[PDB]
Structure formats: C-alpha cells, structure tokens
Design a protein around this ligand. Structure first.
Ligand SMILES: [Ca+2]
Ligand SMILES: [Ca+2]
Ligand SMILES: [Ca+2]
Ligand SMILES: [Ca+2]
Ligand SMILES: [Ca+2]
Ligand SMILES: [Ca+2]
Lengths: 162, 162, 143, 143, 162, 162
C-alpha cells in the first residue's frame, strides 16, 4: 500500500508548511517591532500566531511517530519578503498563506480517512483564523489603509488591543 | 360586540409584527457578521434587539390566551432586503420599522382601554428604543457615514462597545 | 464574485445551508405555536407549554449557528419567509405530537442529506459540523 | 371463541397490538445490533455502545408491556419472526444514526396510527394506554 | 344542550351501579362467613372489594357536585340471590357484574369527552379487576371446583392468602 | 486457517440460538399470563429465564468483537407454537430446547480449545438448567399433570414460588 508512505509524506509535507508559517509570522511580528513601523499590537498578534503554528507543527511530529512513520525534515525557507510594507499588507498575505496551508491540510484529511480523525480539531481552527483575517483585512480597508497611517494606528489599538 | 374580535385580531396583528421585527434584526445582525462587513458590535446590538422583539411577541401570545382569544398565526415575511449596505442604513431602517410597529401598537392601546393596561410597559419601552436609534443615526451621520468606513468603525467600538 | 475567505465550499452546500436555516426557523415557529396551544385554558398543560417554548428557542439557536457557519465559510445568507405552520387539527393533543414527530424527522433528515452532500463534495469541515449539530439535536437531551 | 375477559376490544386492535409487538421486538433487535457495532475495535465508541444497549432493552421492555396488555384485554398473542435488521451500510457511523431515525419514526408512527384506530373504535382504555406508552417513548428521556 | 342533563344522569346512573356492586360483594362476603361455608379469605376478598366499589361511588358523587350537577339517588336493589352456592360461582357472578358495570362506565366516558378526563383512572382499574376475576375463575375451574370442596379450600389459602 | 472463520461462524450460530431460546421462553411466559391459563409463577419463571438467555447472547456478541470476528445476524424465528397447552408441556419443550442448544454449545467448545476458555462458565450453567427442568418435569408428572389442573396449580405455588 502506497497509503502508508503517501500519508507519511503528506504529514512530512504539512510539518514543513506549519513551520514555514511560523517563520512567516515571526518575520511579520518584528517588522512591526522596528521603529519605522512601531505597531506593538500588530507585533503581538503575529508573534502569538507564530507560536500557534509552531505548536501545530510539533503536534504533527508527535503524530508521525505515533503512527510509526518517519519524520523527514526539510529546510525552512525564508519568507518571501522581509519588508511587509503595512499592516493591511501583512494581514492580506497571512490570509493568502493560511488558505494555501489549509489547502494541503485538506488534502491531508481526504487522503487519511482515519478512525482516529486526529487533526480535525486543527482543521476546524484554521477556518476560524481565516474568517478572522478576512474580518481584519475588511476593517483596515474600509478605514483607509494602507495609505492612512491613522487607520492602522487606531486598528492596532482598538481591534488588536482587545 | 365586535370589540372582542376587533382586539383579538389587533393582538394577532401585533404578534406578527413583533415577529417580523425579530426577523428583521436577525437579518441585520448576520449582515454585520459577514467578512465583507465585519462589525461585531453592530451584530451584537441587533441580535440582542432581535431577541427583545421575540420576547415581546411571546408575551403578546400569552396575553391572547389570557384574554380567552384565539391565536391566528400568519407567515413571517422575509425582510425587505438581505444586504443592508451600511451601519447607518441599518439603523435608519430600524428607526423606520420601530415607528411603524409603534403605530399599530398605539392603535392597539386606544382600542383596548383596559382596566389591566397590560402592554403599556412595552409601549413605554418602544419610545426609548426610538429615541436611541435616532441618537444613533444622528451620530453616524455627523461622523461621515456611510461613505467613511472609519466612522462606522469607531462607532462600532466607542458607542456599541459600552 | 467570491468572498475572500471561501475555500472548498461548494455552492450546493451554500444553498443547502440556506435551506436548513429556513427549516430550523420554521421548526422554531412550529414549536412556538405548539407551546401556546398548551397554554390556553382549553388545554392548560403547563409542563408541555414549558417544553415546547424551550424547544422553540433551541431550534432558533440552531438556526443562528447555521447562519454563523455560512458567513464563516464565505457563503451568503438569503432569508425566506417563515411559513406559518400547516398542522391544522389540534383537538386531540396527540395530533400536535404527530406534528412534531414529522417535523423532527424532516429537520433531522435534511441534516443527514446535508451530510451526504458534504461527503460528496469532500468538505471535512462541513462534515464535522453537521455531525455535531445532528448529534446535539438527537442526543442532546440525554448527555 | 371469545375470552371471558373481553370487553369493547375490537379485533382490529388485537391485530394491531400484535403488529406493534413484533415491531418493538424488531426495534430491540436493531438497537442491539447497533450497540455491538460501536463495540468493535474498528469503531470503539463505548458511550454509544452503552446507549443503544440501553435503548434495546427499553424497546423489549416496551414490547412486553404490549404483550401484557393483549392478555389483559382478552386478545391473543401471535408472535412472528423477528427479522434480522436490514440497514446495510455501516461504514460511516452516521448511516447507523439514520437507521435509528427511520426506526424511531416508524415505531412511533404506528403507535399514533394505533391511537386513531383506538379512537375510531371508541376504546378509551386503549387510548389512554397508547398515549402514555407514546409519551414515554418520546418524552421519557427528559422527565 | 341535553349534554349537561345527559351526563348528570349518566353519573347518577353510575353512582347507583357502583353502590349496587358494593352491596353485591358485601352479600358475597358474609356468605363465606357463615359456618356452612367457612372460607375466610373469600370473605375478606369480597369485603375489601365491596369497600372499593363504595369508594368509587362516593368519588362519583363528589364529581357530580364539582360539575354543578344534582345527585338523584335511587334505591339500592338487593342482589339477585342471597346464597351464592360456591366460591367459583361467586367469582363467576362478579366477573359478569364488573363487565356490566364497565359497560355503562364506558358509555359514561364516550358521552363526556372532557378536558378533565376524571374517571379514566377508575376505568383503568376495572380492567385490572376483570383480568383478575377471570384469572381466578380459570384457576378454580382447572382445580375441580365447585364440586371439589378441597379445590376451593386450597384456593382460599394459596391464592387468596397472599 | 478455516479455524478463524469456522469459530466466527460457530459463534454467530450460537448467538442466534440463544436469541431463539430467549424468544421461546418469552412466548411461554405470556402463555401463562393469559386468563385461560393464569399461572403467575410459571410466567415469572420463563420470563426470568428468557432474560437469562438474552444475557448469554449479548455476551457472545461481545466475545465475537473481542476476538476480532464479525457478527452476522440472522432472523429470530418465531417459536414452533404459540399455544403451549400446559405447564408440563412447556417444561418438557424447554428441556428439549436446552439440550439442543447445549449440543451446538458443546460443538462450540471442542472447536475452540482456547487458552482463554471464556464460555465454559455458561456451559456449566446450562447443565444446571437441564437438571432443574428434568427435576421439574419429573415432579409435575408424578403429580398427575397435564390432565390434573390441581397439580399444576400446586406446583406453580409450592415449587415456583420459592
Ligand atoms: Ca496552520
Ligand atoms: Ca417591538
Ligand atoms: Ca433538542
Ligand atoms: Ca426511550
Ligand atoms: Ca366498579
Ligand atoms: Ca442458553
């Protein structure tokens, strides 16, 4: 059965993807830490999420070993850019990224068809994250971002404070 | 006396109206839940009020039975539109709707002239709701709604948060 | 065109959700009517009145959960008329029970149909959702 | 000929009782099978296994109450084969739920039909019985 | 509406019937008290039931007054015979009598069709009594009653003791 | 190895047999419930045993799943007759039935030869039931059953009461 090696690979693939996203949000965070950007709650938001994605990846590694598979690690690619230009951009990219990661994640499920159904909980979580980022993009746009620095200031406070 | 059948009908009429309003605010709420709108406190505000109107209707049904009448239920019509375009619009419509519902509600009172005067409390409540929605329309307008997405953002936070 | 959050969400399901929304709203309305049937002096069963007023509210709660799902996946909510309930003969109180029996089966069945659809279209998210939603309906009364 | 205790007991009902007996016995058998479906390692849901083993026993308890009624009124009990259950596809665990959904509705419906019959034939005793028996089925899970 | 006077009479009719049965079982009991019969548990059995039937009748009188009717009392006829010949006979007669009383009792229900359904509980009780007396007749017969005095002796002990 | 499919079938066969016996004793019980028979302790005796046989069958199903087998259910055939004619007859039939069920049950053991020896306890139980029914047949016969209704009456009391 190619199944065991198909899944063991789909896992290894998903592991590197979640690590990738972790790296991405890590980059985004410290972009907002720098003094020419200086949005602390944007920075917090992404560092948190970066840790979420890392947690996801470690869980997938524990799964691989549980199922008797072997973990084949790949490089963690630097994210596309190191300057994210704006909060609305960084949200927009993250929206794109989660959708792409969700894509393979879905592929991962349809190929498994477990009795155990382990990762379904994290699959449910990504859909919340997607609706949220869309919600966040939507709000920054209607406020006049990216070009209005005030909008992103007030969003950093009122939305990303609470 | 047509009175008993006049009132028993005016009740049945008011019941369907409050249910209608319930449906309306329900629609409005989830309009603000969608990701191309994304105003959570507008959504909360109307879902709450939607439940208020439903409570009102159930009370009117308990009244009908108390008075020995018979409840004749009618369809609950879908609200005029499913896209409310903006927070200021949705407030403006609700202002209109409460005034129209208040109209028949008044008719209901002048026709009753009870010793019991049961619904007078809910009549007093509608007048508060009216003054509030007017207050809310007024504020969104002076802020630059609908065309300014920032105004509605800051209203969703500062007025509809507290 | 397409909502920015939409992924793997077929348009058939978007339409079936909207159908189940109106159905649960209908079921809410029916239970509501059944409640105040038992409230009248001609009948005067306070226990039953208590129960269906509770069932009405749960159905409406179920409806709004569907609505929240629609917007979550990117679909769009189109509300229809909530039809006044069509069960006529309440003279026996058993005909009212029979009404609810068909109502429950109908509501629950569309959920099951909605689940097959979800399985056809390979949407695992929607499958997990319905299952929960369904078991809550049937098995919520116990634990 | 006629049993010495028979009064106002139509022969149609005697036959319908016997039909509902076999039906509840069938429902018992089905639930029993559903229970051990969830017992297998392939599935291994102990909660569900617990539940349907309980539902099986309640149905059989319901069957014997019908039998006790038959003899009470003077009718005679004719047992038929308890058919092995016909729900095939248990691969999804939702198809098993769907089985029970149709089973419940069927069982409950015949009770309702049995009640109309009882009302037609002007048997107040049998009417009170079914109502109880029925409400116990539907509303026993709550209070 | 003849209904009110139809029911008020059906009640008055049922009242006299339950009183009649009370008298009947009273007679039966002391038949078994006499020294040429001397079955104490047959005697107990019927005296108990005689009191049951009396209780039923008093309940029906309380019903009549509850419903605003008027109680019209009739004579309580002596039972058909004062010598019941045997335990099996007395059981057989009681079986007949309960079935006849149940007959009008049924008539009483179909004519009422209350929301209150008050007497349905006593209607349920008669059906138990019927199945029991049949059970009792059946057992005495298979034992060799009436002609075997032993059978009735052992039935008085083993069935009517417990 | 046909062994696994031989046993998994012998189990499935035994399951349907115990269910059959359950049905049989269920029928027998309510035969004694009817008013032309009216032996309550005969009825109790068989309803109890009917539940015993059902318990046995559920245990066998749990065994099948424990051993990784698959349960193939078959129809539960109505018992041979619905009128059992007498207590002695019903005992006699049950004696026959338990011996036949014991037959396959034995076949089930000799084919297994487990280390676990799970069903040996229920095998020990059937032999008690057999000796008992024989004991019961024997006593009814010497008492003059079936033709003496008294015998079965006194047996229902003195043997099947305690
Ligand atoms: Ca992720
Ligand atoms: Ca209102
Ligand atoms: Ca529920
Ligand atoms: Ca149940
Ligand atoms: Ca009586
Ligand atoms: Ca056995």
């Amino acid at each position: 059965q190619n199944y065991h090696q198909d899944s063991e690979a789909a896992i290894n693939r998903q592991i590197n993807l979640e690590l990738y996203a972790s790296y991405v949000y890590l980059s985004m965070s410290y972009y907002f830490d720098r003094d020419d950007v200086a949005l602390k709650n944007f920075a917090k938001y992404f560092l948190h999420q970066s840790h979420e994605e890392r947690e996801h990846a470690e869980k997938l590694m524990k799964l691989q070993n549980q199922r008797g598979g072997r973990i084949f690690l790949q490089d963690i690619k630097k994210p596309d850019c190191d300057d994210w230009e704006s909060g609305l951009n960084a949200m927009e990219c993250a929206l794109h990224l989660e959708k792409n990661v969700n894509q393979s994640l879905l592929e991962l499920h349809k190929l498994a068809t477990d009795k155990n159904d382990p990762h379904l909980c994290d699959f449910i979580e990504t859909h919340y994250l997607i609706k949220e980022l869309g919600d966040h993009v939507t709000n920054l746009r209607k406020m006049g971002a990216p070009e209005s620095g005030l909008a992103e200031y007030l969003f950093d406070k009122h939305t990303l404070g609470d």
